[PDB]
């Protein structure tokens with residue numbers, strides 16, 4: 001159960017905003033200007049790391 | 050050592066069918082315009098959205114897109130397309146920006162700080178100035194408090210600067226907030242009339258209804274392709290699924306908070322989305338001095 | 344009492360950085376320093392942190 | 393003048409008012425949402441109208457048990473005149489008509505639609521779809537500029553059906569602006585006038601987190617209101633309807 005809980009927590013936190021506009025990477029890539037895209041991508045990276 | 054992502058082979062776009070077009074014209078050629086305090090907000094919905102007509106028009110003084118990349122406008126789908134047409138002075142164009150404060154910004158029309166869309170401002174000085182005077186265009190420079198985002202105030206409230214109401218008459222601490230623009234052909238940039246259309250977009254989980262032209266290539270089942278089903282872009286393998294979606298919508302998801310199943314804008318067929326096969330590669334080798342076979 | 348400031352003429356640039364303009368009356372301050380001068384209109388945007 | 397008189401009583405909401413938070417399918421999962429829900433076991437105003445305005449708050453749950461189509465519409469507005477935007481819905485025997493015109497309403501409008509409104513003028517939106525009415529439950533919600541009505545029809549044996557009945561978003565959003573909506577008035581249908589009774593049920597929505605169970609077929613089958621009682625809060629914080637014996641923070 002602990003293992004399943006850890007894995008589920010990881011998968012669930014894959015969808016966290018972490019201060020970004022959206023949790024979907026492709027949406028930000030195809031939706032934002034390259035500097036703002038870099039900023040939001042860096043935020044998501046910090047959260048996922 | 051490395052991964053093994055099964056690279057996709059083809060691409061399928063399955064944007065829904067409407068094959069019609071957008072008002073996008075009567076929100077730009079419209080003979081007459083609106084004030085900044087009294088600004089026409091039209092909701093464009095059900096369309097194909099060919100933004101080529103925008104580029105077909107006159108050059109734009111400030112064609113600044115905040116939430117969306119200007120070149121990628123046709124590719125993504127948007128729920129509601131909004132046309133906000135009004136006339137403001139040239140130096141006041143900069144005030145129409147998310148996170149930027151100014152008289153026109155706060156007392157006439159405040160965009161949201163997280164606004165997503167495009168502001169299309171072009172000079173319209175070719176035919177806006179008349180000898181009589183362009184008093185039709187008006188703006189508010191006094192209000193009790195700051196305007197909330199996407200708010201309209203057209204009522205003329207008596208400015209009660211003092212502790213006693215002005216009672217609707219002129220006197221000390223009694224000034225009308227409304228001010229009429231003065232438009233002259235010989236005036237430089239900053240006082241010349243500028244036509245500004247604000248395209249407000251709203252990305253959310255309702256049917257696109259407005260999605261730049263793209264023809265859907267046919268579907269490809271058991272295989273590994275990109276899918277673009279009403280704006281949700283991804284990678285996976287489309288397989289027949291036994292799930293029975295209620296008529297509500299198509300964005301099927303599982304416990305992993307991932308798009309497990311989706312419905313297409315053709316049949317209401319529900320396809321389960323599974324990730325394309327991938328894994329990690331490992332090299333089993335003996336000692337390097339022993340042999341080089343791996 | 345900052346209401347007298349609003350009682351004057353409309354302000355071209357009433358920019359408050361560290362304090363919300365509406366919260367001015369509620370807050371307490373240790374020192375107030377009034378710096379007055381005259382500059383041209385296009386030079387106003389240079390007076391900022 | 394005033395020619396409709398209503399009598400008020402109070403009743404228990406039981407476990408009605410659960411609606412689908414989004415158009416996302418789910419199977420055999422427990423979901424936690426924070427939305428404008430109808431609180432479980434709350435006061436519900438029961439109105440009997442005989443041949444009267446109500447506030448809107450953040451959302452209204454409207455229930456009817458009528459048979460011979462005594463109710464035939466709804467009216468929404470802030471001033472209930474031509475001065476401010478309104479939203480008028482009429483349910484004839486053939487279709488539904490939704491209008492966002494600047495209708496000026498009577499002091500006691502009632503149901504050819506000559507009596508409900510005196511005049512019509514410049515409008516904003518118009519919608520014609522299949523009729524809503526064919527226990528009828530409706531949930532109104534105007535939060536993020538959109539207008540949402542969720543509807544459901546269940547059979548009758550005795551009183552309000554205690555078992556859980558989900559409300560499905562069939563009529564979808566009208567894409568209005570709806571202005572600062574602050575009130576709500578109902579529309580009862582008379583005939584070409586001996587007697588007439590109505591069975592309005594009005595309940596108010598409130599920001600509250602609920603936990604929803606989806607069966608194998610994607611249908612809500614049970615729900616728990618986290619703020620109802622300590623047991624419900626424990627169920628919410630454990631993400632399970634069943635709770636093992638013990639002590640939980």
Ligand SMILES: *[C@@H]1O[C@H](CO)[C@@H](O)[C@H](O)[C@H]1NC(C)=O
Nearest residue numbers: 291293607608609610611613
């Ligand atoms: C789920 O749907 C299937 C239809 O294939 C039906 O046979 C079954 O009874 C349903 N189960 C429930 C609990 O509604």
